[PDB]
Structures are given as structure tokens and as C-alpha cells.
Amino acid sequence: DQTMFYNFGDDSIEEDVKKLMKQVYVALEEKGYNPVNQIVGYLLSGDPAYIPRHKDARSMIRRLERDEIIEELVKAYLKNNEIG
Amino acid sequence: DSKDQTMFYNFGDDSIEEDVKKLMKQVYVALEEKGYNPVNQIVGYLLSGDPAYIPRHKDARSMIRRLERDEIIEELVKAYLKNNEIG
């Protein structure tokens, strides 16, 4: 309900992960992968070889901590499931 | 207003989607009530598989026993793509 103050760079992890997931999804679909399968394999194993080099998806995903991507997945899930 | 027919040993009727929602709600409430950042405990659990990250509260520990982390992370990823209209 309450208005939030915006400080330049406030939403940087949320926005960073959103940008990354959009590009990673496109890279996976274009190369014929099951995007959910490959993202799960990467997040569980930390093995970047589950992500294509296509569209620089592998290098881009390696620039974020897996814990930061999982954090955003968890925060998004709670919010979209009205948990709070 | 939910119930269960006690007519054979039942190891659960919930779908994985239902189980993940129940786990995430129970853990969030338990941690939020006690002043913890719940997201950090859930993330630490998903990175490790160590139940010590999760409070012993209701059947939290029994829910993580029954779910695999690949299934929890699959549900998180599916939900994230859906809710951000990705694909």
C-alpha cells in the first residue's frame, strides 16, 4: 500500500535477474533446449555447461552468484503466491 | 473444510505445485514470526540440502524430506517465467 522511495540502483538485483532470465530463456529456446530443464540443472549443480554459449548466455549467467538468481526466484514466488 | 479417507496408508494427494506452495508458506510464516529473513534460509537450503537451515515447525522437515530440490527449483523457475510472461 505505502509509496516506496526509489534510490538509483535500488531494484538492481531484481532487474538484473529479470534481464538475465529473459535472455537466457531466449538462448535456450533458440538452440532447442527445454529452458526450465537447463536452468534447474544449472542452479542445482552450478555447472555453467548446462547453459548455451549462444547470445553469451553462459558468460552472462556466470557473472551473477547462483544465490542471487535463487533469491529472486524465491522472492518472486512468495510475492506472486500472496505469501508475506 | 479439507479431510482425508483413512482407508489405506496415504503418502500424500498434493501435486508438487501444491507441496511447494505449502512448504514455502509454512517456512516463511515460521521465520517471519521470529524476525528472520525467510528468503535467505530458503536459498541456503536450496544450495545445500541441509535441513538445519529450516526450523522444526509443523511438518516443514517432513515436506523437505518428501520434495527433491530439483522439483522445488523447477516450480520456482516455472512460476518466475509465467509471472514475468517469459515464453
Residue numbers in the entry:
A (entry chain A): 5 to 88
B (entry chain B): 2 to 88
Original paper wording:
Homologues of the 90-residue ReoM protein are found across the entire Firmicute phylum, and include IreB, a substrate of the protein serine/threonine kinase IreK and its cognate phosphatase IreP from Enterococcus faecalis, whereas ReoY homologues are present only in the Bacilli. Therefore, ReoM, ReoY and MurZ likely affect the ClpCP-dependent degradation of MurA. PrkA phosphorylates ReoM on Thr7 and PrpC reverses this reaction in vitro; ReoM phosphorylation at Thr7 in vivo has also been observed by phosphoproteomics. Our data are consistent with a model in which PrkA-phosphorylated ReoM no longer activates ClpCP, which leads to MurA stabilisation and the activation of PG biosynthesis.
Purified ReoM yielded crystals that diffracted to a maximum resolution of 1.6 Å. Other than IreB, there are no structural homologues of ReoM with functional significance in the PDB. The helical bundles in both ReoM and IreB associate into homodimers with α-helices two and four from each protomer forming the majority of the homodimer interface, and these residues are highlighted in Figure 6B. In agreement with the IreB structural analysis, 1200 Å2 of surface area is buried in the ReoM dimer interface, representing 9% of the total solvent accessible surface area. Other than the compact helical bundle of ReoM, there is a ~ 16 residue-long N-terminal tail, with B-factors 25% higher than the rest of the protein, prior to the start of α-helix one at residue Ile17. Consequently, it is possible to visualise Thr7, the target for phosphorylation by PrkA, in the flexible N-terminal region in both chains. The side chain of Thr7 in both chains makes no intramolecular interactions and is thus amenable to phosphorylation by PrkA. Alternatively, the presence of a sulphate ion (a component of the crystallisation reagent) adjacent to the sidechain of Thr7 could mimic what P-ReoM might look like. The sulphate ion is captured by a positively-charged micro-environment from a symmetry-equivalent molecule. ReoM could thus react to phosphorylation by a substantial movement of Thr7 to interact with this positively-charged surface, which comprises arginines with levels of conservation (Arg57 [57% conserved], Arg62 [99%], Arg66 [76%], Arg70 [98%]) amongst all 2909 ReoM homologues present at NCBI approaching that of Thr7 (96%).
